[PDB]
RNA sequence: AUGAGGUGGCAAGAAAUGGGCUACAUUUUCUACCCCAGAAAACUACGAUAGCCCUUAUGAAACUUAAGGGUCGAAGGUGGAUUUAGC
């Protein structure tokens with residue numbers, strides 16, 4: 403267990419946990435992550451029968467900013483960037499897991515590129531005739547949004 | 556006039572056959588990208604560089620030649636005997 407950590411609460415992760423994997427319970431995978439996890443990481447959860455996420459500095463830095471958030475000031479925009487496959491998505495998921503366990507309302511868009519390509523039913527909107535609706539993309543997200551924030555809706 | 560010039564015209568397809576091109580698809584089709592993606596995937600799929608219509612390019616001259624677009628969505632579902640090429 404040299405690569406694992408017994409601290410499964412993302413609110414208690416610190417620099418001493420860097421490089422160590424913490425476990426995400428199956429209950430949180432169903433509620434917090436009905437979507438957003440990388441497709442290949444989802445294959446690993448099915449194969450290893452567990453979801454373990456390495457604690458890294460990008461997420462630790464961002465967790466430090468969110469724990470000191472001044473909710474009176476306007477919302478701050480944090481942007482994760484880096485080369486392909488460096489762990490941008492999973493760093494975001496580690497932060498989503500922190501706020502989910504702090505009773506925040508999670509508005510998670512797992513992949514915004516899916517809303518600008520490969521749309522079969524692109525209907526015209528009735529609320530605004532100059533805009534287009536996307537019933538399949540919108541209904542899919544509503545189902546996952548309901549699963550994550552069911553206790554607040 | 557078996558020579559010279561002018562005007563207009565033929566150069567088609569019952570059929571057979573040689574070579575080639577494109578396909579019959581999932582190691583595929585479309586898009587992004589040029590290789591860590593998203594979709595498509597059987598009668599609105601794959602599949603025409605064919606047919607029909609229009610535009611454009613060249614030209615004095617274009618149903619005719621070429622390019623592009625629209626429309627159209629066929630045979631084909633991997634091919635018998637035989638046979639070609641490659642160290």
Ligand SMILES: Nc1ncnc2c1ncn2[C@@H]1O[C@H](COP(=O)(O)OP(=O)(O)OP(=O)(O)O)[C@@H](O)[C@H]1O
Nearest residue numbers: 440442443455456485486487488489490491492493
């Ligand atoms: N924190 C982590 N814990 C465990 N595995 C990780 C972690 N970060 C990255 N990985 C591994 O790297 C892979 C890629 O991670 P991820 O998809 O988050 O990267 P990314 O930079 O967002 O990728 P892309 O550039 O494609 O959007 C994961 O599927 C996993 O195998």
Ligand SMILES: [K+]
Nearest residue numbers: 573574575576
């Ligand atoms: K042939």
Ligand SMILES: [K+]
Nearest residue numbers: 578633634638
């Ligand atoms: K053949």
Ligand SMILES: [Mg+2]
Nearest residue numbers: 489490491492
């Ligand atoms: Mg990512």
Ligand SMILES: [Mg+2]
Nearest residue numbers: 556557558559
């Ligand atoms: Mg004569």
Ligand SMILES: [Mg+2]
Nearest residue numbers: 599600601628
């Ligand atoms: Mg078709």
Ligand SMILES: [Mg+2]
Nearest residue numbers: 603604605606
């Ligand atoms: Mg044509």
Ligand SMILES: [Mg+2]
Nearest residue numbers: 612613614617
């Ligand atoms: Mg002209």
